[PDB]
Ligand binder design. Structure first.
Ligand SMILES: CC(=O)N[C@H]1[C@H]([C@H](O)[C@H](O)CO)O[C@@](O[C@H]2[C@@H](O)[C@@H](CO)O[C@@H](O[C@H]3[C@H](O)[C@@H](O)[C@H](O)O[C@@H]3CO)[C@@H]2O)(C(=O)O)C[C@@H]1O
Ligand SMILES: [Cl-]
Ligand SMILES: [Cl-]
Length: 138
């Protein structure tokens, strides 16, 4: 297994046709998962499944610039389940991050941070057993 929080360097940042794959298992009674694609201290793409926000399950996505959170994008389709193995795939495309979970399309997040080649770390955190984190060019 890997230790969470886990930092995956993205050398030279991200670029279209880069596919990032995260395999793990959600802990029992999970509260959260987070993927943070960082540009230095900024977070270009924060992907944050929340298992109990006012007793609903929701994925919150956002960008952090100069320590300020932007306008949240919220997706109520929620494919994760406490206790269960998952696969998150993040495919970088020209205008957005495209996310699939367990081989099903979940959401897209338009690029707010434009300097894709400076988005050079992925932080993976939260209530998971992390098995693998990697990337490949497709
Ligand atoms: C790092 C740490 O110690 N704590 C958290 C922080 C803090 O709990 C928080 O910033 C203190 O106010 O929160 C972090 O998660 C935030 C992040 O997911 C953003 C994305 O937009 O949302 C924040 O919650 C919002 C909430 O969605 C709104 O409905 C509400 O009106 O405002 C909330 C606070 O801004 C999350 O707290 C963070 O990265 O800041 C995660 C850290 O682990
Ligand atoms: Cl970085
Ligand atoms: Cl930018």
């Amino acid at each position: 297994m890997l230790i969470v929080p886990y930092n995956l360097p993205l050398p030279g940042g991200v670029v279209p046709r880069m596919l990032i794959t995260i395999l793990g298992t959600v802990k029992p009674n999970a509260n959260r998962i987070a993927l943070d694609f960082q540009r230095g201290n900024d977070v270009a793409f924060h992907f944050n499944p929340r298992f109990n926000e006012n007793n609903r399950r929701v994925i919150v996505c956002n960008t952090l610039l100069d320590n300020n959170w932007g306008r949240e994008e919220r997706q109520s389709v929620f494919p994760f389940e406490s206790g269960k193995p998952f696969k998150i795939q993040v495919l970088v495309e020209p205008d957005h991050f495209k996310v699939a979970v367990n081989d099903a399309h979940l959401l897209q997040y338009n690029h707010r941070v434009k300097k894709l080649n400076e988005i050079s770390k992925l932080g993976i955190s939260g209530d998971i057993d992390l098995t693998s984190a990697s990337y490949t060019m497709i």
